[PDB]
Amino acid sequence: ENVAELKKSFNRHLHFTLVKDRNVATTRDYYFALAHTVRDHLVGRWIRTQQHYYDKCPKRVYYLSLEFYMGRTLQNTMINLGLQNACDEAIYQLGLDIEELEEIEEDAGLGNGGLGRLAACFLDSMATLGLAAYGYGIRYEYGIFNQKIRDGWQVEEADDWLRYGNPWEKSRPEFMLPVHFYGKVEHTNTGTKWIDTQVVLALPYDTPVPGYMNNTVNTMRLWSARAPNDYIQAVLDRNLAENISRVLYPNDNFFEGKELRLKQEYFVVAATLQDIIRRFKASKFVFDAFPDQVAIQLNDTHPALAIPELMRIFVDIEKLPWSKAWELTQKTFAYTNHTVLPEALERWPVDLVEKLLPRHLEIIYEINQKHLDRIVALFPKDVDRLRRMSLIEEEGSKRINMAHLCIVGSHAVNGVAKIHSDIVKTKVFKDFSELEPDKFQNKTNGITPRRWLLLCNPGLAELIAEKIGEDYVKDLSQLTKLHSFLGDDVFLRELAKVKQENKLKFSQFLETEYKVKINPSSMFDVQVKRIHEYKRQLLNCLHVITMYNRIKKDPKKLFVPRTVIIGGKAAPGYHMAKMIIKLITSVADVVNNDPMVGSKLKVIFLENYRVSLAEKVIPATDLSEQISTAGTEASGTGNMKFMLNGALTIGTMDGANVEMAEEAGEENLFIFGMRIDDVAALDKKGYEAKEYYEALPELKLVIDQIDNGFFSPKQPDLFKDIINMLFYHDRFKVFADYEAYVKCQDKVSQLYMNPKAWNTMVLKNIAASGKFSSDRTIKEYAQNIWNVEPS
């Protein structure tokens, strides 16, 4: 606990655990010694917490997800355990730099973006709320790839995060389980049997999840695939079974029907459900009480197979009758929808499923038959309603609509922001909500204020605590008390000072990683998120070039200097996203080297955007770019992180941006562009991109520069694919929000010129960010879906 004992443990681990002394120990050795020193502090409570759940047997919550975008664990653990100050002191006394030790840790990047990071924030919140919750996923050998930029383009490198060892995971060999694939179904007089299957073992690894200052330490269980049991070739072929948990599919909001992805989904699902049933049978609590002891949240449709798998276990194995089994199943599962973009919908062809999971295909067909029998009985004449509500789309080569399977097999279905949940309920699944009104809900996303405030921005956390105490950490709504300081000049300077320090520290980072020199006086304009056409960093890029031309046309004009930062990873096979990245690095090259613009404007493509880098750049941001086309971003969470950390937002009325406006007051955000209904109008009328190109002189110059090679001289036609998409296939109407966006941007610079007014708006944003704590989000899930209670 105290400094002396922490130093003693550190030296002890460096010695016995790392087998080193101070003259031969590497930096990595020191990081590992500290990690083990911190990890030791988790054990007692990890054991008690899990023992407690067995004793008092509260209802358990299982968050089933193919992704857990955890980031680093060291600092997060020290903070939630109240050990950071002591460890900082101990490490300092040992003559070491704790910051350096922390940078040695690899991010556990087992996620693509929002969906995976939401799972991570939820685990922190559920532990902080004292819920008997478990995270269940896959332990990928390789997470989201490390991004490099070569000659302006994205290059992918394997994310070998486990190469040096992960001290934060605990193998649980005694819980290994067999998972089945392929084979065939036999309908015997003893029950249908699934036989001649190939077997792959599932080895679980537990990672502790410390609640914030509360003695609760929950568990995240990730499964790894292992082979069971010419000789050499046979041994090498063991790689095939093990490839199942080998790599995270690098796609964000995009469906790719590869068989290996289907294997991963069944793998997690099968291992997870069996483990859950086994723990249920040992609870010394037949399966009638199951739904009162178990809640399983389906994170998107990725784990949809859990439904037919639970049915398979209840029926084929436990011999329960179908009706009883189906009843228990619905009461067990709840489904969370995370998107409305067509390219992201999971639709598995029945042939692939038939080959890999013959018995699940049969169970799904059965589910679908009973389902449609009901509709036929309710709307005998609506024949097309049946076609629309079926789990099977015969529309060409038959496929399974996984979202529909999740809806019929779940008692609750929720979206992740009001605007989104509404669209899901009344438009996308109108036929279903009409039948079961009460089944559809909304649960607006949230972020954990531990990692995204206390951890990433200690200066702000301290300043806030200075003024209003520490209650806000566990009750973020407490930030409204900050309103008492609206006219407090001294406080406003203190707030600005914290942002300035964060910017200074991040600028140091930028100068050492990039050739560029940073004007620390500039406004940090930031857009960090996965590269997507719908998120439109392309629009941001149009505005950047626009500011460039303005400086060239009139260099002596008064101008608020900016440092424009854009970062994010493109899915490997997403060609347009890769072109967009190259467009940004090209533009940056011209801008950063034009002697006429100089320190007026700097552009940086932030490489390898991931959780640990987000913790650095967000606290250093002044302007947060949240410009997705109205109706495309289901919720967003980066928007919330920026709001909590003192940045103002420039964005569309989309996803949770709408709620950030409700809480803070629309005028305290720079809202702009078409709204959901305006986008529909343009669609109805038909979008003619050329018209804006024609009518907007600044837009036309930008476009022409791009298309003629102004930014790619050595290859004039390089950006032709973008031009063509922009003029003839822009599903996201980049040109249609261009004018309002730029006008809006000008207004931002205006406000920035007035520090007191700017920080006054910042204060209103921070003071109103309380609704976005994931602790609030989780309370709502616990109360209205899982029916469990905080402790």
Ligand X SMILES: CC(=O)N[C@@H]1O[C@H](CO)[C@@H](O)[C@H](O)[C@H]1O
Binding region for ligand X (CB under 6 A): 113-115, 118, 252-253, 300, 338-339, 344, 416, 445, 633-637, 655
Strand ranges inside 217-274, DSSP E: 217-226
CB-CB contact of 611 with 143 (8 Å):
no
Name residues contacting a copy of itself, limited to 67-126 (CB under 8 A): none
Could you give the strand order of the β-sheet that contains 392-393, starting from the edge strand earlier in sequence? 347-349, 399-401, 392-393
Whether 535 is catalytic: yes
Q: Report which DSSP code applies to 531.
A: -
Whether 700 is catalytic: no
Task: Give 605 or 772: the residue with its C-beta nearer to ligand X.
Answer: 772
- Give the whole-angstrom CA distance, residue 736 versus residue 738: 6
Q: How far is the CB of 42 from ligand 700 (least distance, A)?
A: 4
Task: Give 258 or 552: the residue with its C-beta nearer to a copy of itself.
Answer: 258
* Number of chain residues interacting with ligand CFF (CB under 6 A): 11
Whether 49 is catalytic: no
Quick one: what does residue 616 bind among ligand PLP, a copy of itself, ligand 700, none, with the CB cut-off 5 to 8 Å set by partner type? none
Q: Which residues contact 77 (CB under 8 A, 6 or more apart)?
A: 38, 39, 41, 42, 83, 208, 210
Site string for ligand 700, 132-171 (x = CB under 6 A): --------------------------------xx-xxxxx
* Annotated binding-site residue? 246: no
Question: In the set 95, 173, 686, 697, which binds a copy of itself (CB under 8 A)?
Answer: 173
Quick one: what does residue 239 bind among ligand 700, ligand CFF, a copy of itself, none, with the CB cut-off 5 to 8 Å set by partner type? a copy of itself
776 belongs to the binding site for a copy of itself (CB under 8 A):
no
Question: In the set 4, 57, 236, 753, which binds a copy of itself (CB under 8 A)?
Answer: 236
529 belongs to the binding site for ligand PLP (CB under 6 A):
yes
- Give the whole-angstrom CA distance, residue 276 versus residue 263: 20
* Beta bridge pairs of residue 135: 63, 220
Strand ranges inside 337-439, DSSP E: 347-349, 392-393, 399-401, 412-415
Residue type, 233: Q
Interhelix angle 697-708/537-553, rounded to 10 degrees, is 100
| Number of neighbouring beta carbons within 10 Å of residue 509 | 15
- Give the whole-angstrom CA distance, residue 362 versus residue 297: 24
Task: Give 153 or 365: the residue with its C-beta nearer to a copy of itself.
Answer: 153
- Give the whole-angstrom CA distance, residue 349 versus residue 346: 10
- Give the whole-angstrom CA distance, residue 343 versus residue 534: 11
- Give the whole-angstrom CA distance, residue 415 versus residue 154: 33
Q: Which two tokens stand for residue 295?
A: 């809640």
* Annotated binding-site residue? 237: no
Helix (H, G, I), strand (E, B) or coil at 492: helix
* Annotated binding-site residue? 550: no
Q: Find the catalytic residue in 41, 450, 499, 529.
A: 529
CB-count exposure of residue 461 (10 Å: 0-12, 13-18, 19+): buried
Site string for ligand 700, 11-30 (x = CB under 6 A): ------xxx-----------
Whether 339 is catalytic: no
Q: How far is the CB of 317 from ligand 700 (least distance, A)?
A: 30
Q: Find the catalytic residue in 530, 562, 600, 733.
A: 530
* Annotated binding-site residue? 388: no
Q: How far is the CB of 156 from a copy of itself (least distance, A)?
A: 6
- Give the whole-angstrom CA distance, residue 329 versus residue 304: 12
Quick one: what does residue 47 bind among ligand PLP, ligand X, a copy of itself, none, with the CB cut-off 5 to 8 Å set by partner type? a copy of itself
| Number of neighbouring beta carbons within 10 Å of residue 480 | 16
Closest residue to ligand PLP, judged by C-beta, is: 638
- Rounded (5°) CA angle 751-752-753: 90
Whether 530 is catalytic: yes
Rg, the chain, Cα only: 27
* Annotated binding-site residue? 97: no
Quick one: what does residue 167 bind among a copy of itself, ligand CFF, ligand 700, none, with the CB cut-off 5 to 8 Å set by partner type? ligand 700
Task: Give 148 or 700: the residue with its C-beta nearer to a copy of itself.
Answer: 148
Q: Which residues contact 1 (CB under 8 A, 6 or more apart)?
A: 83, 86
Name residues contacting ligand CFF, limited to 506-535 (CB under 6 A): 532
Name residues contacting ligand PLP, limited to 618-647 (CB under 6 A): 636-639, 641
Catalytic residue numbers read: 338, 529-530, 535, 637, 641
Contacts with ligand 700, residue ranges (CB under 6 A):
17-19, 32, 39, 42-43, 46, 164-165, 167-171, 208
Binding site for ligand PLP (CB under 6 A): 113-114, 117, 529, 609-611, 614, 636-639, 641
Q: Which residues are annotated as a binding site for AMP?
A: 21-23, 54, 278
Which residues of the shown chain bind ligand CFF in the complex (CB under 6 A)? 153, 251, 253-254, 343, 532, 571, 573-575, 578
